[PDB]
Symmetry: none
Subunit: 132 residues, 7 copies
């Protein structure tokens, strides 16, 4: 919600300082690039945790046990995709991770906006200069 709110404020243009906005637009691209890249770094950390959780759970459900517990439901291969997926522990990491996937995806749009706000800024110079 903070990302929607941040970009919303940023893409609006001060018509009176166009030379400044032309310069600051690149400054905004950077800013969103900075968040974008750290999130991927984050997702990489979270995705790594996810790789471990499925195996730990893979052991448990298959009878290799993960702690002091073993599954008695004797799940088959046809049942496995659902079971791990519905698992409380795996779900938490997948839930968090996918959230970041959304966070990351918004920043793509932000870069799309900023690339074009910079375009729009030149346009105004152009659309105004015509009256001359």
């Amino acid at each position: 919600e903070d990302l929607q709110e941040e970009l919303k404020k940023d893409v609006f243009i001060d018509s009176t300082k166009l030379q400044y906005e032309a310069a600051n637009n690149v400054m905004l691209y950077s800013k969103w690039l900075n968040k974008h890249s750290s999130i991927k770094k984050e997702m990489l950390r979270i995705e790594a945790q996810k790789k471990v959780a499925l195996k730990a759970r893979l052991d448990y459900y298959s009878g290799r046990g993960d702690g002091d517990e073993f599954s008695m439901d004797r799940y088959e291969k046809s049942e496995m995709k659902t079971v791990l997926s519905a698992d409380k522990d795996v779900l938490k990491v997948d839930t968090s991770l996918q959230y970041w996937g959304i966070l990351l995806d918004f920043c793509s749009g932000a870069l799309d906006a900023i690339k074009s706000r910079g375009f729009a800024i030149k346009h105004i110079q152009d659309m105004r200069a015509f009256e001359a």
Copy 2:
């Protein structure tokens, strides 16, 4: 470190309007600078790419019963179970986490090259609005 690349780029894109011409000529120098980082990163990742390719097989032997040295797994994992196991493997996970990290840095540098390419565009716009003052 990511903090060293993000912040450095931050510094680069700010434009001194009173020295518009310096920035215009120098802007091409920034592109060059990052293109150097970019390429140097890929060089690293390619080396890690080899390490991972060796690590995955080495571990694949271990778990599959072909052994990894004097070691063999007792968990008798099956082929349908295999992708998950290597993916969660200590030895593999370290290199892949390592490998992906530079890849992210690599990914940051593409954006910089977008930024710098457009800073060069932004600079001309400023010249134009100034020439417009005329």
Copy 3:
């Protein structure tokens, strides 16, 4: 070819002598050619190596699958699903693909080099414009 020396090379090229702006405009088309030349020359090398890689890859696929590669044969009895993984780690594959991919990076670099110069020509023009403004 070495990457840093290409890096070292491009760096000198993008520098602009403002005292020779007509010359630099003319010089720019020559730099484009030169990097255009490198670019195509990298492809010739990679194509040759990629032919070695295809030869190495066939040989190792035979080796590991039990058809043997020379006077030598693998006893680890790998299956078809296991082959992709093993071949990637294969010393001969690994050595050549590493080399193959390495030039590709130099290939990817000369594109960057060509993007730098193709746009450098504008930057030279940008400078001229700000000057007519000073007038």
Copy 4:
């Protein structure tokens, strides 16, 4: 045609004579055309080579699949999954594709030449601006 011989050709072509700017501006479109001619004749060649390649591929597809290719038959009993690798390394296949890709090196370079020449006219245009101001 040779790759490096075109590079030298482009090398001479991109040179700009400061004493003959009207000529250079006019002759520049003549350069686009000429390289526009090389680019197109190369493609025509690739059309002939790629047809041979597709034929080599079928003949070899038969051979390794056990249908025999002329008076020869493959005894290695390659499977469907293995064929892609094997065909790529096959000498008959490899020779035509190597040749085909070589023009590909040539094709792309001529594209670059047209790009250099496209802006060389601007570089030519660039200098005029610097001259009238110098006046």
Copy 5:
């Protein structure tokens, strides 16, 4: 023939320095001539693409065991083999080459439009250099 288009364009882009006003006007006229060739070629290719689409099916029948006339294939080709088999097929290859031959032509006619657009530019450029003495 491709060689007929090459020789023609060569003749076209040549610029008569002494009759510049005329050449500025004719350049727009040349765009037309080549624009006419270009579209007529797409016209040609449109016919061939219908021919090619018909052949792949007729041949598809032959190789798939459905027969293409009074004939049937004994090679028992699998799905993995088909793209290759059809591609190398005498009937398919003949029509597709023709399409490709024209495709090569079409792109040359485009290149010609690239030329004419900038010949128009160069013409103005030269006039400026004329005013340069004056």
Copy 6:
């Protein structure tokens, strides 16, 4: 519309009457319009034909996939890997796509027409300038 009629008309349009430079300059904006009408109106047609085709593709697909299209069913029992080839060659589809693809050529010719005229205006100024120069 016929393609040759577009070619014949455009040819007539781009001609420049030197003895009437003031008129040709003004009228040039009037030509953009005429072809602008063609371009948009052509699209209007293709938009209708595209609809005829989308319905045809479904109708024949049903036929061939065995859902039947009328009182008819294909006994050739075509598969998924085979369908795109089969539908593409279909007599009814082939007739409609040809139609659609043909109007596309007209559309594109008009884009070229718009390319041509838009620069003809540049040409008109240039000539005038060379006249003002001789003046």
Copy 7:
């Protein structure tokens, strides 16, 4: 609504240049630019609305054909996932909303053409003002 002939006819009348009121036409030219610029933007409002219907209609129809639709209509012909893209396009409602969607794009596209003409018409007027100095 809007008709293409009305945009064509409107634009046609708009770009014609009165040589005798050239100072005026210079003033009149900018008045045209705003007007189409407003049309350009006004068409976008319609398409954004119709396209929204299409996002829903396709979604409503995809459910229908896949069997998740629950109304008084149900798809019994059992279409598969590879077949859906093909089928949905031919759907009576989808075809109509798409036809509608595609149409406004053309009116939209015409104003862009219209704006390039007027954006540049101002220049042509400036040229003629100038060609007089040659007679001068």
